[PDB]
Design a protein around this motif. Structure first.
Motif, PDB file in Angstrom:
ATOM      1  N   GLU A 105       6.252   8.216  14.237  1.00 43.81           N
ATOM      2  CA  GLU A 105       6.629   7.814  13.588  1.00 43.81           C
ATOM      3  C   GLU A 105       6.596   8.643  12.543  1.00 43.81           C
ATOM      4  OE1 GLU A 105       6.930   3.229  11.483  1.00 43.81           O
ATOM      5  OE2 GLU A 105       6.656   4.451   9.015  1.00 43.81           O
ATOM      6  N   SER A 106       6.987   9.109  12.005  1.00 41.02           N
ATOM      7  CA  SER A 106       6.440  10.915  10.967  1.00 41.02           C
ATOM      8  C   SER A 106       5.614  10.253   9.652  1.00 41.02           C
ATOM      9  CB  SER A 106       7.350  11.502  11.093  1.00 41.02           C
ATOM     10  OG  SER A 106       8.908  10.550   9.748  1.00 41.02           O
ATOM     11  N   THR A 127       2.479   9.329   7.858  1.00 40.80           N
ATOM     12  CA  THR A 127       0.655   8.482   8.527  1.00 40.80           C
ATOM     13  C   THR A 127       1.078   7.327   7.524  1.00 40.80           C
ATOM     14  OG1 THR A 127      -1.882   8.895   7.872  1.00 40.80           O
ATOM     15  CG2 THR A 127      -0.290   9.739   6.503  1.00 40.80           C
ATOM     16  N   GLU A 151       1.413   4.860   0.646  1.00 38.92           N
ATOM     17  CA  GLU A 151       1.920   5.204   2.345  1.00 38.92           C
ATOM     18  C   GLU A 151       2.419   4.013   3.120  1.00 38.92           C
ATOM     19  OE1 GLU A 151       3.397   7.807   3.127  1.00 38.92           O
ATOM     20  OE2 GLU A 151       3.199   8.659   1.015  1.00 38.92           O
ATOM     21  N   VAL A 152       3.354   3.742   3.342  1.00 41.22           N
ATOM     22  CA  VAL A 152       3.446   2.325   4.182  1.00 41.22           C
ATOM     23  C   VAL A 152       3.661   2.275   5.627  1.00 41.22           C
ATOM     24  CG1 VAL A 152       3.717  -0.582   3.865  1.00 41.22           C
ATOM     25  CG2 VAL A 152       2.968   0.307   2.043  1.00 41.22           C
TER      26      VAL A 152
HETATM   27 MG   LIG Z   1       6.854   7.272   6.055  1.00 38.79          MG
END
Ligand SMILES: [Mg+2]
Ligand SMILES: [Mg+2]
Lengths: 590, 5
Positions: free
Chosen positions: A43-44, A46, A58-59
């Motif tokens: 996943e890009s 964090t 950020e989730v």
């Molecule tokens: Mg993200």
């Protein structure tokens, strides 16, 4: 008056549900897909929070998809059809003034407690309070209330908002007893704040372990209540799904080349053509596919999006001039391996796209708004500039300069300046990753030819999300995807009320009475013919305002994956159902 | 997602 309720196992905003009440499974799945094996994904960016609904921090995408569930499950082999997931059924009166969901008696949280109407009511109120997307999406839903042992009734502010029963099946259901409970440190939990405590859901996977900001290990629950439910047969097969986070795309791809990441979705035409000269690509160990499925029945606008909250972009002539300065033909040929098609509609790739001149009902709808829409909607089909050769490039730049001159900007010492103040015309293009720089640099170089000081500012994904939430940018490289059933979400994209509300998707800051009126007409469209005509009318008006510089797109997702991953023989017509319908070949081989 | 050159 009220009548004896009619219960439905599914809802559809277009056509009829493909599957009847009592269907065993979706047709495309492998009903005998084995449970087991590890899937390693990337996943890009964090993550710094597990709170699935709060639009702060950020989730990780895996939390809402694997740990939480919604009332209805959307079928990937249909356009908008959704089937009972946590809900067994749905009931609504003919005027659509309310909608009632009956919860499944077998639905349970991972802690063994039942999923209750109190949980649905809490979840509804909380998504509206803490998530601007759902606050807008459900703005016409006044309340959620327990109306029976297993019933939740949602009440609406106006009749005939036809998609409301369907869209209410899309928000995650969260455990009220858990969020109103205490953590291990004796501190009361708080849904209004970010958290790094692993959250509990009713979904097939639990958060087993994690390294904050770097990785999350999701583990399949053998006690998942819905394991044998029709919509889940042949789905949720990997025992472990690991997500590793990368701020550097090249490091992310190197992890895929090493076999440490099993699947890679490639968003770069040049990378797709050149980065795959490695041994596993030559002996069948890695598979490459160009999959059209997830982009079928989807409209796309990808664009350079100026921020009209800023004075420099308020004049339509300035925004139009930037399109004349963009050379798509050169970008497609010289950098993109001729892979892309120019976008010319906010609903590009669908029947909802406006074309030519308005006719029939579309023209009639615009006629009732003639004093409020650009004159071009009745006279001028929308077209983008074309740069077939070098003389044409210079002529299109001359047209850009002419529009700037009309707007009050002139070339003085080969720098484009405000003719009254002398202030140079300049702007920053905010990008979320260095991977966008190669695509954007030609536009920067083109506007520099007509005296504009445009500069790229590349930041990381966390800073990008934070800046976009507050509209802290001159211009972004943006995207809006559309379904074949435009509805309640439209006001989040172009509605006036979203301009000065943080966290909306109104990136350009559009505020227009006619657009607002067309959005209202879409939401309350009495039938499909009226919805299609009104949508084409909205597209025509948006395009005639030159709010963005439309870019380009393609009709297929480029994916590469290691051959130990197995997929259904035929993917669902409108999706990939990845990773849920996929499974491990290592497991199948015992 | 966004598509790039
Ligand atoms: Mg993200
Ligand atoms: Mg899923």
């Amino acid at each position: 008056m009220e009548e004896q309720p009619v219960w439905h196992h599914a809802t559809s905003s277009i056509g009829e549900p493909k599957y009847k009440d009592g269907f065993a499974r979706f047709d495309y799945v492998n009903p005998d897909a084995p449970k087991g094996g590890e899937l390693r994904l990337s996943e890009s960016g964090t993550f710094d929070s597990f709170n699935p609904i709060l639009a702060k921090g950020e989730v990780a995408t895996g939390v809402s998809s694997l740990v939480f569930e919604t009332l209805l499950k959307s079928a990937e082999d249909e356009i908008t059809t959704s089937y009972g997931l946590l809900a067994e059924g749905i009931s609504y009166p003919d005027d659509i003034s309310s909608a009632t969901f009956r919860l499944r008696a077998e639905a349970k949280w991972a802690d063994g407690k039942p999923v209750t109407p109190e949980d649905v009511v809490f979840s509804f109120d909380m998504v509206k309070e803490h998530n601007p997307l759902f606050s807008n999406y459900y703005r016409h839903v006044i309340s959620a209330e327990k109306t029976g042992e297993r019933d939740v009734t949602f009440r609406f502010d106006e009749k005939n908002n036809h998609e409301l029963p369907n869209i209410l099946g899309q928000f995650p259901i969260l455990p009220k007893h858990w969020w109103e409970g205490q953590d291990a440190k004796g501190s009361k939990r708080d849904i209004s704040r970010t958290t790094l405590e692993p959250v509990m859901g009713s979904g097939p996977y639990k958060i087993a372990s994690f390294q904050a900001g770097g990785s999350i290990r999701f583990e399949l629950r053998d006690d998942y209540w819905g394991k044998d439910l029709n919509v889940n047969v042949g789905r949720y097969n990997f025992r472990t799904i690991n997500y590793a986070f990368f701020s550097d795309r090249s490091v992310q791809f190197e992890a895929f080349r090493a076999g440490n990441v099993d699947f890679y979705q490639d968003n770069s035409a040049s990378h797709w053509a050149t980065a795959y000269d490695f041994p596993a690509m030559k002996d069948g160990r890695v598979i490459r596919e160009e999959i059209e499925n997830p982009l079928r029945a989807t409209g796309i606008m990808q664009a350079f999006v100026p921020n009209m909250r800023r004075e420099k972009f308020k004049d339509q002539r300035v925004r139009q001039a930037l399109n004349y300065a963009f050379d798509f033909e050169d970008l497609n040929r010289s950098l993109a391996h001729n892979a892309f098609q120019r976008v010319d509609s906010y609903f590009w790739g669908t029947e909802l796209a406006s074309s030519g001149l308005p006719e029939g009902r579309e023209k009639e709808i615009l006629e009732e708004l003639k004093d409020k829409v650009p004159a071009a909607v009745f006279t001028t089909p929308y077209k983008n500039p074309v740069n077939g050769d070098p003389q044409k490039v210079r002529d299109n730049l001359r047209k850009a300069l002419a529009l700037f001159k009309e707007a009050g900007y002139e070339l003085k010492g080969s720098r484009l300046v405000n003719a009254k103040t002398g202030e140079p015309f300049s702007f920053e293009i905010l990008l979320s990753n260095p991977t966008f720089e190669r695509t954007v640099t030609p536009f920067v170089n083109s506007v520099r030819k007509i005296g504009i000081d445009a500069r790229i500012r590349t930041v990381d994904d966390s800073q990008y999300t934070n800046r976009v939430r507050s509209y802290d940018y001159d211009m972004i490289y943006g995207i809006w995807a559309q379904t074949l059933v435009p509805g309640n979400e439209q006001s989040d994209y172009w509605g006036s009320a979203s301009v000065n509300q943080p966290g909306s998707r109104n990136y350009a800051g559009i505020a227009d009475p006619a657009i607002d009126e067309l959005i209202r007409r879409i939401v309350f469209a009495p039938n499909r013919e009226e919805l299609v005509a009104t949508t084409r009318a909205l597209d025509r008006v948006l395009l005639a305002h030159h709010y963005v510089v439309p870019l380009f797109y393609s009709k297929a997702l480029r994916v590469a994956y290691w051959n130990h991953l197995a997929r259904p023989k035929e993917l669902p017509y409108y999706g990939m159902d990845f990773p849920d319908a996929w499974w491990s070949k290592n497991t199948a081989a015992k | 997602g966004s598509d790039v050159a």
